[PDB]
Design a protein around this ligand. Structure first.
Ligand code: HEM
Ligand SMILES: COc1ccccc1O
Length: 153
């Protein structure tokens, strides 16, 4: 459980993200695919774009980054009271996309990386610690939902 002050640091930097959701989403997904190429296998071969410039030019990738960050932002704004937002996400990611918790740790690391790269003055140690706690809680609760659906994460 996060304190109210930790939630405030999470949501303070998230408002910075919302100034350019598409740009952040592009940076986060490109960082994920570069840091962990295997994650690009969960998306079908139709992509597997070969260069960074192709990734940045991809309207499909940009639109998807917005979809991802919008869902995460909706969850974060619930400050832990997120069962109703999290359940459909767990359903699709356990039973259709088959995304292990390990991959959620990878994308959390990418989120942290891009937030620090773009917003260092609003993402010092206490804000990094609060975002880390928020994403840990997200991953814990989604793992529990995964198991409830029969997916061992
Ligand atoms: C913060 C973490 C994440 C959030 C909030 C998120 C959310 C979503 C949302 C809202 C969609 C569209 C609706 C749906 O099917 O549920 C989606 C699609 C998808 N997501 Fe995730 N997701 C993340 C974790 C991941 C990771 C780590 C991978 C791959 C390693 C992944 C790849 C999947 C795939 C494969 C689709 C279908 C894409 C397509 O339309 O072809 N996601 N995601
Ligand atoms: C769903 O579309 C994409 C997601 C991630 C990377 C490239 C894409 O076209």
């Amino acid at each position: 459980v996060l304190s109210e002050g930790e939630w405030q640091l999470v949501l303070h930097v998230w408002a910075k993200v919302e100034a350019d959701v598409a740009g952040h989403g592009q940076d986060i997904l490109i960082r994920l695919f570069k840091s962990h190429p295997e994650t690009l296998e969960k998306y079908d071969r139709s992509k597997h774009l070969k260069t960074e410039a192709e990734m940045k030019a991809s309207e499909d990738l940009k639109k998807h980054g917005v979809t991802v960050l919008t869902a995460l932002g909706a969850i974060l704004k619930k400050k832990g009271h997120h069962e109703a937002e999290l359940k459909p996400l767990a359903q699709s990611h356990a039973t259709k996309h088959k995304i292990p918790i390990k991959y959620l740790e990878f994308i959390s690391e990418a989120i942290i990386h891009v937030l620090h790269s773009r917003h260092p003055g609003d993402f010092g140690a206490d804000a990094q610690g609060a975002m880390n706690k928020a994403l840990e809680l997200f991953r814990k609760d989604i793992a529990a939902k995964y198991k409830e659906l029969g997916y061992q994460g």
